[PDB]
């Protein structure tokens, strides 16, 4: 259907089918066991943020790779269940739609993960070239295949050079995996999210240290954001003022999976609504905090 | 009497093929992923169909996108699904299967979905005249013993040439299922059942459990790389060496490949010694391949 010009928030990244099995004890190799419960969930960073944006009240779209089949059909119906626009999916003739097996031990609480295979090709710069960008007001990129994503980010810069400031597409980038290839993405986007895991891997012991130590890696006028679990989150802009919000923990912590993505989508949402960086930081902490005391994404708003 | 019927489960096997078995609390990437129609009686139908035997499957299924995958797979193989007990309540069962590519060890984490089992009432509706052989996968024992009494009752009212041959698989070490030992012309006892009863070899298990079988029945026990053994009314132990592939890559459904191949061979009038050997042959060929294609 007809999407009004400059109305959508696009999230580019991974979508995976996570099969989560709760077991009494970890299975020994060569055994046939019965799980206590099993859940099929749509996962992935960009995919999780999409759900959160829909629940926040934003028209939102997902861009990612899928191969036709029964897995992709489950994932699409789940995206559609969450009001996500799936028209930009980069459908692939070769490879498997990502699927992961997670085994949770009910006794000790430990998670054993069999990650999805490498077979499916990631969204390319040539796939991104074919996209009419005018229906987007904001483009969020989950850092994966960096050399290709750098070109997509250059395409958005070119688009923006030709627009009046009120028709310029805002851009955000997430560096969540501690992979060297990804670190070149700090130099792109108006908003750069760096994970606590990446910061710790780079030798930083706090969100303050990470922001001060990495701000030199960003482009002029960019805001660098770091969430540090129960320590809340910090942001640092061109003015040199380290902004901070304390976490809003739930009465009891139930499910932190995808709380990082909830933070990211809530910060993006709040900024896209004309709120300030301090306001966006606070709101992101409030929404991610509510999420941690809930199973899944129901009732985060 | 031209079709073999397999009564049991149909389960969606969500497979991950790994180069090593994951250590607890670890994170490993898999080599490849695939969906496969599973369930013991379902896997035996795949094998029977590839062997050229017209066969039928009977089991519970719940309508949905997964059952649509399962049904399309059954049809692509020529398996008759007309006998399926479609349920209004319950989800289709599924399992996560980790296959170790370096030794073929398969680990199954099954999600049993409260789907109601096939009952003696469901069985009562079946036209027994189209079946040469009926194989029953041991699940709801008390309810299956009734299904078995019905075939025996049909047999009494038939000439010896028109009798329906019956096989039973006791794969899970559950005491409820030991009453099925019990019924049938051919009884398949697993290595896991046999071990759980204190036996250390196929021959030990057969000598120890023969006392439980029906007059004139053949008790069969496969023992992985040790091949398989069989024991009949004549008291003569029969053995077959395994046919291992040089590289064992996937044992998922090897047990079902063996049961189906033994059933097919016997249904074709071959001796117990030949059927045992054929079972080991097809099961061993399977262990060198991913899935069931290419076994014959
Ligand atoms: C944006 C985020 O940094 C992503 C993670 N997240 C939180 N993570 C928490 N964890 C507890 C465990 O150590 C582990 O599961 C992670 C605890 C809290 C909470 F306590 F504040 F609720 C929050 C919040 N918000 C917020
Ligand atoms: C009917 C069966 O008993 C069911 C299992 N099966 C086999 N299991 C094998 N393994 C099971 C475990 O993963 C480890 O012990 C290896 C190996 C072989 C093979 F090596 F002979 F190929 C066969 C054969 N056939 C035959």
Swiss-Prot record, chain B:
Associated pathology: Fructosuria: Benign defect of intermediary metabolism.
Residues bound to beta-D-fructose: 13, 39-40, 43, 256
UniProt catalytic activity: beta-D-fructose + ATP = beta-D-fructose 1-phosphate + ADP + H(+)
Domain of life: Eukaryota
GO molecular function: ATP binding; fructose binding; identical protein binding; ketohexokinase activity; protein homodimerization activity
BP GO annotations: fructose metabolic process; regulation of glycogen metabolic process; response to fructose; response to glucose; response to insulin; response to sucrose; response to zinc ion
Family that this chain belongs to: Belongs to the carbohydrate kinase PfkB family.
Name under which the protein is recorded: Ketohexokinase
Tissue-specificity statement: Most abundant in liver, kidney, gut, spleen and pancreas. Low levels also found in adrenal, muscle, brain and eye.
Metabolic or biological pathway: Carbohydrate metabolism; fructose metabolism
Enzyme Commission number: 2.7.1.3
Keywords attached to this entry: ATP-binding, Carbohydrate metabolism, Disease variant, Kinase, Nucleotide-binding, Transferase
Species per Swiss-Prot/TrEMBL record: Homo sapiens
Pfam families, A to Z: PfkB (PF00294)
Cellular component terms per the entry's GO annotation: cytoplasm; cytosol; extracellular exosome
Binding site for ATP: 106, 224-227, 253-256
Record note on quaternary structure: Homodimer.
Regulation: Requires potassium. Inhibition by ADP.
Function of the protein: Catalyzes the phosphorylation of the ketose sugar fructose to fructose-1-phosphate.
């Amino acid at each position: 259907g007809l999407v009004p010009r400059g109305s959508q928030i696009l999230c580019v990244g991974l979508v995976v089918l996570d099969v989560i099995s709760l077991v009494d004890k970890y299975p020994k190799e060569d055994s046939e066991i019965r799980c206590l419960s099993q859940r099929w969930q749509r996962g992935g960073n960009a995919s999780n943020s999409c759900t959160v944006l829909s629940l926040l009240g934003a028209p939102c779209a997902f861009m990612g790779s899928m191969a036709p089949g029964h897995v992709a059909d489950f994932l699409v119906a789940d995206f559609r269940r969450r009001g996500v626009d799936v028209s930009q999916v980069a459908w692939q003739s070769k490879g498997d739609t990502p699927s992961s097996c997670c085994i949770i031990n009910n006794s000790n609480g430990n998670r054993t993960i069999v990650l999805h295979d490498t077979s499916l090709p990631d969204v390319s710069a040539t796939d991104f070239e074919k996209v009419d960008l005018t229906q987007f007001k904001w483009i969020h990129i989950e850092g994966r295949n960096a050399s290709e994503q750098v070109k997509m980010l250059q395409r958005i810069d070119a688009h923006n050079t030709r627009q009046p400031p009120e028709q310029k597409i805002r851009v955000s980038v997430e560096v969540e995996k501690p992979r060297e290839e990804l670190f070149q993405l700090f130099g792109y986007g108006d908003v750069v999210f760096v994970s606590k895991d990446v910061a710790k891997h780079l030798g930083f012991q706090s969100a303050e240290e990470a922001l001060r130590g990495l701000y030199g890696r960003v482009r002029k006028g960019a805001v660098l954001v770091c969430a540090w679990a129960e320590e809340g989150a910090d942001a640092l802009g061109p003015d040199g003022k380290l902004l901070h919000s304390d976490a809003f923990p739930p009465p009891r912590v139930v499910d932190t999976l995808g709380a990082g993505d909830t933070f990211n989508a809530s910060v993006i949402f709040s900024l896209s609504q004309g709120r300030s960086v301090q306001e966006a930081l606070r709101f992101g902490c409030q929404v991610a905090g509510k999420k941690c005391g809930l199973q899944g994404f129901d009732g985060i708003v």
